Amino acid sequence: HPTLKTPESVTGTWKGDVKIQCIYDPLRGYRQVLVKWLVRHGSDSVTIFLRDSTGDHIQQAKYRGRLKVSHKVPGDVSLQINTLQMDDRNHYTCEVTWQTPDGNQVIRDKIIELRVRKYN
Amino acid sequence: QVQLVESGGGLVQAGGSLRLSCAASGRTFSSYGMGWFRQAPGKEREFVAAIRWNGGSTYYADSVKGRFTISRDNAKNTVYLQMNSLKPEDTAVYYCAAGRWDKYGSSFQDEYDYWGQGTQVTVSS
């Protein structure tokens, strides 16, 4: 399966915008079937974004209208956050599910720490 | 660059129990899923057990299911492997590893970034 490639951490500016990269090289046989982004919520995680066969779903009021996950370049499922909040400092998980020719599904994920600085 | 150091290895009799630990350096321990792997003489390195960043999900190789339990203390930057009902075939060098997987892939060595030097465990009979 494709390696999910992410930086270890990303730093953005308070009230600015930032991208958290999550990219894999497409690989013959492996069809992407689900993408999720999750954020830590105390001692577990919660979904903040899902892309599936019916498109993108961002259903929390705190996120709807300010998250964009890349969609035009195969393998690029990077998350961009509009107007960073100090409380956006957190660990974010990029999670991708692929299907193989035999119908097997492989799921991989990666945790990226997001830091938020008050000024540039 | 996180450094990992295993402790607690040694000689134990078959049927006995042994507790390994692994200390991680730094202030970002909770950024990592942690795992134990082992490598016996002549054999390739294989998965033993893993534990999610939160200490709340664990994963085991079929070879050690039930007998071995992995745990972590994020306040101490430490992961533990409690090995019960030991068998001579559990003899190996045991390696601690850290990676940025969350819930998935923990049985695969390529999902880990950093490795300890390993500690010898010998189970005699």
> What is the rounded CA–CA span in Å between residue A8 and residue A29?
28
| DSSP codes, A6-56 | --SEEEEETTS-EEE--B----TT-EEEEEEEEEEETTEEEEEEEEETTEE
Looking at residue A5, the DSSP 8-state letter turns out to be B
Report the gap between the CA of B107 and the closest CA in chain A (Å). Answer: 12
What backbone phi and psi angles, to 5 degrees, belong to B88? Answer: -55, -30
Report the gap between the CA of A74 and the closest CA in chain B (Å). Answer: 22
Name which CATH class applies to B1-125. mainly beta
**Experimentally determined by:** X-ray
Among A35, A32, A62, residue whose Cα is nearest residue A51: A35
- Give the domain ranges of chain A: 1-120
Q: What resolution in Å is listed for this PDB structure? A: 1.2
> What is the rounded CA–CA span in Å between residue A83 and residue B42?
55
What residues are paired with B84 via a beta bridge? Answer: none
Name which CATH class applies to A1-120. mainly beta
> What is the rounded CA–CA span in Å between residue B114 and residue A69?
29
Among A63, A53, A52, residue whose Cα is nearest residue A92: A63
Q: A110–B100: do the CB atoms touch at under 8 Å?
A: yes
On whether any CB of chain A is under 8 Å from the CB of B57, the answer is: no
For residue B30, give the chain A residue with the closest CA: A91
Element (H, E) at B39: strand B33-39
> What is the rounded CA–CA span in Å between residue A39 and residue B87?
41
3-state secondary structure of B10: strand
For residue A42, give the chain B residue with the closest CA: B54
